[PDB]
């Protein structure tokens, strides 16, 4: 047993390793989406910048969970980072819709993690999830919902003018 | 009844007074350890500085609980601050190991306090403990574990050179 | 065919996608090594910082290859990022030796990539590899060789004092 | 024989004179396109500014090749600069498509020049072409491809609103 370990359930330790993988997976999805918009036949540079920034944020999310695992005396076990579900993201609207679904899936995993921490009476882990993850997810989901709404109302994806102007005025 | 008191159980009030005493006791333990390293036959000035800083932090922890007691309309009842369990702390490694055990004991008391606040449906007290105490304890326990590990790997306590160099490079 | 594509062989396009995966894999290896040294029973913070910096550099290497793929009109195809070969990296010396082998493996892949670009008469791709990758690898391999040599001469891994002092004086 | 000449084939000397003419021709094409957009019945000032900047860059490309010819001991022989193939460039999209084709034609000439320098074992000339010309062409072709894509997706050339807004938001 680690000399620092206290009130840290083996199920919580395992769930944190699963969350680390999911954050790394989300980083990879956003990296894929970013360079789709860097293609010469897509060419929306602020969509590319937006998703690249999101990718780097997810890597930070993963590193903070790795730090937490060691802080509590658990042991990090890494797994393969699966490739994203699409190679071609179709349009600015479709990528925003995919990102919305991704962030809701990550949120559901964090809510299940919080339920486990609550069931195992781990208030430090509960506070960690609430402080660093839950409102971040609520803000991300709201922002992506806003983006999807605007793109739809502007006429995307059929209007290439809509995605061009959204790229300039909202993401620029 | 205090005019400010609301949703503050008498058991919580009593548990806060017990925690105040424990924080003051921890301040006293660290004060004792600090001046052990100021002895002419020990003479590790950065161990002394490190433990003195920890002593002053524990006094701040106690004062914040005294403030909380009054904020919620409870009444502070102080008890004797017991002297530390050792007069002679033996070595830098032994003192670090004692500090690790002390911080884990304080953490266990805070976890029992949080369980009580949860059982009495006191979300303000739960948040107070989480925000100001629980991660502070996790960070302190991790730091002390790190220190113990390094001292052991360097050859302490048998190597006086190890404790000298740790004093200079980690605590300096 | 992409409207920008010129003198860019399909074999080169495929080899660039394989190199993207290898750079991402190297980023993951270094991330794993970094947080091993953040464990409370290892506790070498400058080893952790050094490998984390290397991890972020490899992600930059991968992103630059993704940019190149799009610049030349190829299409990015991502694959799973395999988990590193170790969960436990044993010691500072063993991790440095693993990093040395990793960087030599990445270098060999880049040399095979340059041979392909030479065979397909792609001077832009040759120059890209030479300018941004080949000397970076030579410098990384030399630095890691230097680190391995010093750790061995100091008495690592058996001397925990050696790894402690190397952490402070070379990586700090 | 020039006192500075060393490892500089007469075929390379001739090919450099041909490249000088092609760079000057490209400068002239871009100058023509620039002032088309300055016409009162076209009136897209940022298209005009963009192509004028490209024109001045091509003149710099030509001057650097003239410097190289003298550095290596070859002798500059100038030829007529042919007028561009169009007087009327039709639209912003059509001019961008013409510029894309021009830059790909210049790139093909540079690749043939590099093949000659490789065949004559002239590594200084190879490095000169790679360092100062080949990535410049790849970046120019990618940028023009991006511009063509955006104009097409926005509805150009039939939408005068598309070219107006592209002039303001991408070229402004
Ligand atoms: Mg995340
Ligand atoms: Mg698969
Ligand atoms: Mg918050
Ligand atoms: Mg305290
Ligand atoms: Mg007594
Ligand atoms: Mg907090
Ligand atoms: Mg690399
Ligand atoms: Mg496997
Ligand atoms: Mg070469
Ligand atoms: Mg170089
Ligand atoms: Mg040119
Ligand atoms: Mg004529
Ligand atoms: Mg260059
Ligand atoms: Na435990
Ligand atoms: Na357990
Ligand atoms: Na937040
Ligand atoms: Na908020
Ligand atoms: Na009450
Ligand atoms: Na009560
Ligand atoms: Na804290
Ligand atoms: Na923390
Ligand atoms: Na090609
Ligand atoms: Na091909
Ligand atoms: Na370099
Ligand atoms: Na060098
Ligand atoms: Na010669
Ligand atoms: Na000759
Ligand atoms: Na360049
Ligand atoms: Na570039
Ligand atoms: Pd359980
Ligand atoms: Pd009660
Ligand atoms: Pd030293
Ligand atoms: Pd071939
Ligand atoms: Pd010849």
UniProtKB/Swiss-Prot annotation, chains A, B, C, D:
GO cellular component: autolysosome; autophagosome; cytoplasm; cytosol; extracellular exosome; extracellular region; ferritin complex; ficolin-1-rich granule lumen
Tissue: Expressed in the liver.
Residues the entry annotates as binding Fe cation 1: 23, 58, 61
Annotated GO MF terms: ferric iron binding; ferrous iron binding; ferroxidase activity; identical protein binding; iron ion binding; iron ion sequestering activity
Binding-site residues, Fe cation 2: 58, 103, 137
Stretches of the chain forming a coiled coil according to its record: none
Main location: cytoplasm
EC number: 1.16.3.1
Stated family: Belongs to the ferritin family.
Function: Stores iron in a soluble, non-toxic, readily available form. Important for iron homeostasis. Has ferroxidase activity. Iron is taken up in the ferrous form and deposited as ferric hydroxides after oxidation. Also plays a role in delivery of iron to cells. Mediates iron uptake in capsule cells of the developing kidney. Delivery to lysosomes is mediated by the cargo receptor NCOA4 for autophagic degradation and release of iron.
Name by which UniProt lists this protein: Ferritin heavy chain
Lineage: Eukaryota, Metazoa, Chordata, Craniata, Vertebrata
Gene name of this polypeptide: FTH1
């Amino acid at each position: 047993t680690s000399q620092v370990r206290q009130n840290y359930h083996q199920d919580s330790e395992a769930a944190i390793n699963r969350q680390i993988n999911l954050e790394l997976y989300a980083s990879y999805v956003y990296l894929s989406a970013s360079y789709y918009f860097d293609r010469d036949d897509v060419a929306l540079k602020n969509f590319a910048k937006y998703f690249l920034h999101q990718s780097h944020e997810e890597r930070e999310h993963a590193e903070k969970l790795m730090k937490l695992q060691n802080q509590r005396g658990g042991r990090i076990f890494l797994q393969d980072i699966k490739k994203p579900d699409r190679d071609d993201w179709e349009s600015g609207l479709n990528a925003m819709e995919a990102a919305l679904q991704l962030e809701k899936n990550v949120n559901q995993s964090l809510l299940e993690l919080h339920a486990l921490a609550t069931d195992k009476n781990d208030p430090h882990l509960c506070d960690f999830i609430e402080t660093h993850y839950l409102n971040e997810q609520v803000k991300a989901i709201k922002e992506l919902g806003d983006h999807v709404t605007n793109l739809r109302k502007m006429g995307a994806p059929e209007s290439g003018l809509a995605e061009y102007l959204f790229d300039k005025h909202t993401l620029g």
